[PDB]
Each structure stands twice: as structure tokens, then as C-alpha cells.
Amino acid sequence: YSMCDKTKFKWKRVPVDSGHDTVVMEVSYTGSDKPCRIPVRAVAHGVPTINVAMLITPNPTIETSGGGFIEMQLPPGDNIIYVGDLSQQWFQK
Amino acid sequence: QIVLTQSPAILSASPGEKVTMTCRASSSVSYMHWYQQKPGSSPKSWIYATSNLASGVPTRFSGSGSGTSYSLTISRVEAEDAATYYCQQRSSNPRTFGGGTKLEIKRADAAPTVSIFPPSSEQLTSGGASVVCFLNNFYPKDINVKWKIDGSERQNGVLNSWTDQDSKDSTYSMSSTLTLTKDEYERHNSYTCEATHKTSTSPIVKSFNRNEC
Amino acid sequence: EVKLVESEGGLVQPGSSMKVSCTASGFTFSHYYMAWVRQVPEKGLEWVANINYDGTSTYYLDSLKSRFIISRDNANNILYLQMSSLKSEDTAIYYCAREEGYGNPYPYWYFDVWGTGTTVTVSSAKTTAPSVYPLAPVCGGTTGSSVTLGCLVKGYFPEPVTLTWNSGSLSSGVHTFPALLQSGLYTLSSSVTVTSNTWPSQTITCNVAHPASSTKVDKKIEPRVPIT
Ligand code: NA
């Protein structure tokens, strides 16, 4: 599949702790090039060149209906999550 | 700092055909980026990381390359593509930009629409006198203008300024200003602006008389 | 939408200082590296400086490292550039820009959003306000279904000025020509073409602003009458 437009995302449920040392979130998409792949990244605050988002949901995707569900595991410390143009701070452990 | 060589400086092409512009680097780089700029506004991200299209960019565009040679290609050019395109590297400190390639889109030849304007009452009260001629929506860009006062050609005091190509109809425009003093303007009567363009051997002539109405 | 808006520029004497700013909206400002890039007359684009998330690291073009300082205020969504000991070679259009590419090596990163730009002029010359002249058609008039009107902005320094017609509600049929320099002062003109049933049954106004002299003028285009 092709990548979604990064400028057409909105938070549906902001990231929260899952209860088993992972992070879960939900987004919505207003583009018409569906279905498409969601771009997901995360970095340690001090090292912005290395992706540390270990995904539990493989290849998150926006279908022809519904939103998107994403779950990831992050290393301890201060991190930043990127989903398209959306962003969120997350402190782990 | 790495030197970036874009060619050609001006790329002129007919609608529907495929074009390629090139950017060569003096030392090896691992990615190249591209930006579009239209007159009066700021640059805009167009291609990033060699071959990825930014949001909203039509799929007629593409990009490729590696090492010391990269390129940008348009499959079928359109009138709205007229702009300047810049390449940029961020592999070596400091990051650097190329010199740009300006894309021109060809169309059928068109004659100008000519309009002439006497000095305003406010400028004559201040002591000056400027006569202005507008030559609008023509193609190609080359054109000549000649001023005549009481039938005799005048060459001193003329300033001309061209626009860049219009992205809607692919035409150009030009303004011409003849500057005189108030008393010098008051000593003559007829004022004429003559435009010669490749669309016709005869010029387009517009004129007025100072003392009428 | 993501948007970056720069402050006003101006004219300054060689050796003096000036501070410009850039206000961000539509995204979480503290989650992105930011930068300044300038466009120099007859030379092109040139990077100036950039800064990390929290301002603890800054980087500069080597020939500028002693004259420029970049900083940021994350809670107030604002980026700053402070200039000192300015030279004539620093005259340019200065753009604010957001960086992108996190999660990849540095050579992958690029500029994904740019600001509107602000002009800084370093000169020993004095500020000069322009004269604004309306251009109505020849008296007696011409026939036809369309009429062209003009506006002439003469004798100002420094650049730039901003010109609109009817505060921007007239867009089609407008041609604004690049300014030209003559004996130290700039001049600019503009034309607009409307239908014969438009003017003079509707007011048409040329709006001109020149910040460096704090000039703001609105000139109505009026039919020509004989004056003695
Ligand atoms: Na119009």
C-alpha cells in the first residue's frame, strides 16, 4: 500500500498506559486516498535520529471505514511519538 | 562547503511533453531535496529524501539519483508547473542550496493589450509628470516599446519592467514609464506609446492629446 | 493548519543591531527543531542557523557565528534571531522554517514548512516615504466592455512596499510589476482590468503600505475632470 497524507490526521484517543508496559492510541483520517499506511515513529528526547517505536500492531492502516489503532513499546526515559503531523510527549518507566 | 550545479538555468517546454532538470554535487551526498518557489511567495517543500512527494504534489512529478548526480522529472508538463525549482543537500556541514532552474511553458503567440495614462493631477501639482503605458498578456517575452512626443521619438527617461510568466494562461506583461518635468510636459500636446511584437509587422499604437477634454 | 508568521523587519545602520521573531501555530512547537534561512539579492538561498528541541544546542554558518544568536520560548510558541555588528552583506529576506525527519539519520532531514519572510536592510541612507498616484483613463473615455486602471508608487527607500486592490477582494485581472531602482530610490506600478459596468459604479481603491516610514494610504480611482 501507499502512505497516508501526514497532514490529515486527528487524535481520537491520546496515548495512555495499557497496563502491560505498552502505549495505546487511536487516530482518525480525513483523506480520500484510502486504504493507506500510517507513518509512525518515536525518538528518545536526546537522540532524535534513531527510531525506537517497537510496534505491537504490525503495519497500522486506515481502511475504507473506521479509524486507526496503534500500540507500541518505548524505552525508559523521555520520548516523543510522531504519527504523521501529530506528536505527543511520553515518559516511560 | 559543497557546491551544487543546477542545469539548465532556464527550461522551456511545450505542454504535454516530458522534461528533466539536473543537480550535480561537488562531493558525494546521500540524499537530495527539492523546493518550488513562485513569484511573491516563499519556497515550498516539493520532493524530500530524493524521491518522496510532499503533500498535494501531483504524481506527474518524480525524483531520482545517487552520489554526485540527482534529477527531477515531470511526465507531462502543465501550465501551472511554471516556477523556479531548487535542490538542497544536508549531508555535509553547512547545508547548501543550488542556483535554481526556472521552468517556462510554451503557448500560442499572443499580441498585447495596450493602455496609456496621462500624469495625475496630484503629480502635476507636485511638479512632476510621468506618462505610463501598460502592455498586458502577451507571448513570447520579447517586445519593444517606442515613445513619441508631438511626432518625434524620445529616448531619455524611459524605464521598463517585466513580470514573470503567469501560471494560469502562460503570458507575460510589461510596464513602461516616461518621466518629464511639469513645464516640459506642458509645452507639448500629443503623446504616443507604440508596441512592436512578433505577432504583427505593424505596431499597436495608443495616444492622447494634452489639451483635449 | 501549520503556520509560521514573522515580525516586521526594517532599516538599520552598519554596526547596529536588530531582533526579529517568528510566531508558530497549529502544532506542538516544542516537538520540532527550527531554523532560519535567508534569500540574498542575486545570490540565492543560504542557511543561517538552527536549534534543538529545548534550546540547549545551537549551530551557525561559520562566517556568521559571531554576529547572530538564535533562541526560542516554547511556552509562548516563538523563535528569535538577534543580529549585531551588521554589515551591508547581511541585507536579505529572512525566512523562518520548521525541520522534519526525526527517526532517520541527519542527511535525511529537510524543511517541511516555511514562513512568510521579513526584509532587513543595512544602509547608511535615510528612509524615504513614497508618493502614491492614481491613474484613471484618458478623459472623454473609450468604448469597450473592459477598462484598465493604474496605481503608481514613486520614490521610496528601503524596500519593500505592499500593494493590494480593494484590500485583496480584487484578484483576477491584476498585474503588479517588479520595482526598479533609480538614483537611489525605488518605483513600482500596478494595473487592474474590470468590466465597463464595474467602474465607476463601484469604488475601486489602491492600498499601499510602507512600514519603514509608517505609511499607509488608500487611494480611490476617480474620473478625470479639468482643473485650472
Ligand atoms: Na478584475
Side-chain angles (χ1 to χ4, degrees), chain A, chain B residues 2-213, chain C:
Chain A
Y1 286 97
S2 194
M3 300 302 304
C4 307
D5 193 317
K6 78 172 189 180
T7 75
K8 300 180 182 299
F9 282 103
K10 297 177 183 177
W11 283 122
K12 188 175 182 177
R13 293 180 184 178
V14 294
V16 296
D17 193 308
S18 72
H20 45 266
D21 292 322
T22 63
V23 184
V24 298
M25 70 210 60
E26 293 188 54
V27 302
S28 65
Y29 186 68
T30 66
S32 60
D33 59 327
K34 302 182 293 182
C36 56
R37 286 285 188 269
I38 305 177
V40 184
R41 297 161 298 159
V43 298
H45 193 276
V47 191
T49 54
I50 290 176
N51 183 17
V52 300
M54 288 193 302
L55 293 171
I56 309 308
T57 56
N59 299 330
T61 298
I62 300 288
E63 302 286 353
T64 54
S65 64
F69 177 82
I70 303 172
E71 181 184 23
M72 69 178 64
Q73 184 181 22
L74 300 173
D78 212 16
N79 309 280
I80 303 181
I81 309 174
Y82 298 94
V83 180
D85 271 353
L86 305 172
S87 65
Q88 188 87 324
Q89 175 203 2
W90 185 260
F91 177 81
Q92 175 60 44
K93 191 185 73 176
Chain B
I2 296 182
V3 166
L4 297 176
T5 293
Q6 291 191 251
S7 66
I10 298 176
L11 183 42
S12 181
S14 296
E17 71 193 36
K18 167 184 176 181
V19 300
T20 297
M21 64 190 67
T22 305
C23 174
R24 301 187 201 268
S26 70
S27 204
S28 184
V29 304
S30 58
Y31 297 99
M32 194 69 72
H33 316 295
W34 298 80
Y35 306 89
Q36 185 195 74
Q37 191 180 30
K38 296 196 172 190
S41 39
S42 68
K44 187 186 312 175
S45 178
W46 212 246
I47 302 180
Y48 68 91
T50 299
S51 57
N52 304 96
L53 296 186
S55 175
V57 174
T59 65
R60 297 177 293 100
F61 287 84
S62 70
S64 182
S66 73
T68 60
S69 188
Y70 291 74
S71 65
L72 177 151
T73 293
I74 314 179
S75 64
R76 301 166 298 265
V77 307
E78 297 182 357
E80 61 170 355
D81 298 336
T84 299
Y85 296 81
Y86 297 98
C87 59
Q88 179 231 350
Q89 66 87 16
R90 206 233 203 256
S91 295
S92 169
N93 302 282
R95 66 197 84 183
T96 52
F97 291 83
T101 285
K102 182 156 63 181
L103 179 67
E104 185 201 39
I105 308 297
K106 298 179 186 294
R107 58 155 290 153
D109 287 2
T113 304
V114 184
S115 305
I116 189 173
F117 297 87
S120 63
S121 297
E122 292 174 23
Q123 189 188 22
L124 289 172
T125 301
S126 81
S130 296
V131 190
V132 178
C133 200
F134 290 134
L135 292 64
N136 286 344
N137 299 84
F138 61 86
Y139 186 95
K141 189 172 181 170
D142 280 317
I143 199 166
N144 292 308
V145 58
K146 172 195 296 180
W147 288 93
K148 288 185 176 178
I149 306 170
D150 278 340
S152 303
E153 181 178 349
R154 170 63 177 271
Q155 301 162 331
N156 299 278
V158 182
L159 298 180
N160 307 318
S161 179
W162 274 258
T163 69
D164 276 309
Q165 189 172 40
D166 190 281
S167 61
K168 282 189 178 182
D169 69 2
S170 308
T171 62
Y172 298 90
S173 296
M174 187 263 262
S175 178
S176 180
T177 302
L178 166 64
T179 302
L180 311 170
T181 67
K182 178 197 172 183
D183 300 320
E184 186 179 4
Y185 172 79
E186 294 286 2
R187 285 197 294 269
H188 302 275
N189 185 60
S190 100
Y191 295 86
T192 302
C193 167
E194 291 187 9
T196 300
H197 191 250
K198 78 171 294 184
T199 40
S200 183
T201 302
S202 64
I204 301 182
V205 184
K206 298 280 177 163
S207 79
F208 67 94
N209 292 317
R210 177 182 54 81
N211 53 31
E212 302 208 348
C213 49
Chain C
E1 71 171 3
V2 176
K3 190 162 174 55
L4 305 161
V5 179
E6 291 98 326
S7 65
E8 182 184 322
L11 168 67
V12 105
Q13 289 197 68
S16 297
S17 309
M18 190 182 293
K19 190 174 186 177
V20 302
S21 74
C22 171
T23 297
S25 60
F27 64 103
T28 305
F29 178 71
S30 64
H31 294 167
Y32 300 86
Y33 283 47
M34 303 285 308
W36 292 96
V37 178
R38 69 187 180 183
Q39 195 160 29
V40 186
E42 206 187 352
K43 266 186 69 74
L45 302 163
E46 182 178 42
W47 170 72
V48 170
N50 79 319
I51 180 178
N52 69 355
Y53 294 135
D54 57 358
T56 54
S57 300
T58 60
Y59 313 92
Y60 300 91
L61 184 68
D62 179 82
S63 48
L64 307 176
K65 64 194 177 182
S66 290
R67 304 195 301 270
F68 286 75
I69 302 178
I70 186 178
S71 65
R72 65 192 298 166
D73 181 352
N74 281 347
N76 281 311
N77 292 282
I78 184 160
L79 177 75
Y80 299 104
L81 183 62
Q82 170 77 53
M83 312 173 269
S84 60
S85 298
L86 283 163
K87 301 186 178 189
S88 74
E89 291 84 1
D90 295 314
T91 294
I93 302 179
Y94 286 79
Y95 296 105
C96 181
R98 188 179 88 170
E99 299 193 79
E100 180 59 65
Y102 319 101
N104 304 269
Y106 283 123
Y108 185 99
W109 297 22
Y110 57 102
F111 299 121
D112 77 336
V113 185
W114 298 61
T116 64
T118 188
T119 303
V120 180
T121 308
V122 186
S123 177
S124 299
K126 292 186 172 181
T127 304
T128 306
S131 299
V132 184
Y133 299 129
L135 305 184
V138 187
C139 54
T142 72
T143 63
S145 51
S146 285
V147 68
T148 301
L149 316 170
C151 193
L152 178 67
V153 181
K154 184 174 185 60
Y156 60 93
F157 184 85
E159 284 193 303
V161 300
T162 64
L163 186 150
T164 60
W165 291 96
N166 279 42
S167 299
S169 300
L170 264 69
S171 50
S172 84
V174 169
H175 294 291
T176 297
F177 302 86
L180 296 179
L181 183 61
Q182 177 84 354
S183 291
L185 297 172
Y186 291 96
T187 300
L188 172 154
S189 61
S190 184
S191 75
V192 59
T193 302
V194 300
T195 66
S196 179
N197 285 306
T198 309
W199 184 88
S201 75
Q202 297 285 277
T203 302
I204 301 294
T205 302
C206 178
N207 317 110
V208 179
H210 186 238
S213 58
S214 298
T215 296
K216 179 182 177 184
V217 182
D218 298 309
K219 297 295 289 188
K220 183 174 178 174
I221 312 293
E222 304 273 24
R224 295 182 186 262
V225 301
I227 310 176
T228 221

